[PDB]
Amino acid sequence: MEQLEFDGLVLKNLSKTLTINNIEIPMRIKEFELLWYLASREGEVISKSELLEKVWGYDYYEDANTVNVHIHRIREKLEKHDFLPYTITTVWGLGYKFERSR
Numbered sequence: 277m278e279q280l281e282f283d284g285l286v287l288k289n290l291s292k293t294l295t296i297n298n299i300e301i302p303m304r305i306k307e308f309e310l311l312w313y314l315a316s317r318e319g320e321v322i323s324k325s326e327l328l329e330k331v332w333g334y335d336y337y338e339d340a341n342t343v344n345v346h347i348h349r350i351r352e353k354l355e356k357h358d359f360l361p362y363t364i365t366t367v368w369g370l371g372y373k374f375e376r377s378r
Contacts, residue, residue, distance in 0.1 A: 280315050282362045285354070287312055296359045303353060306335065310346050314364060314374035323371040347372055 280287040286295045292308045294301055303311075313331050314322060324343045332342070347364055354363065363377045 277316065280312075282315065285359055285362060287315055296354070296357050299357075301353055301357060303350075306331070307346050307349050307353075310343075311350050311364075311374070314372060315362075317374070319373060319375050321367050321371040321373045327372070343372075 278289050280289075284297050286298075287308070288294065289312055292305050292312075294303055294308060294311070310327065310331050313327065324340060327343050328337065328340060347366065351364055361377055362374065365373050365375055367373060
């Protein structure tokens with residue numbers, strides 16, 4: 277898959293950019309790759325460990341809590357640009373999942 281669409285949110289993996297209502301939203305590459313990994317697995321709860329291993333596999337991190345920080349950054353950007361119908365749900369202690377809101 278090169279492109280995912282979720283009611284107005286479009287993820288473009290070739291360019292590692294994202295649009296909301298066809299407007300590009302600045303996002304760093306790690307944040308995009310995290311979002312892409314989750315949205316590619318809509319509805320699946322992905323543990324911090326799998327995210328660190330498969331999204332940061334090559335990049336380094338002092339602190340596993342870089343995952344949480346990045347989840348928050350993604351949700352802040354979606355929320356700030358009034359994107360409501362999909363979000364990343366935190367499943368406490370278990371992981372994160374991209375899914376329809378509620």
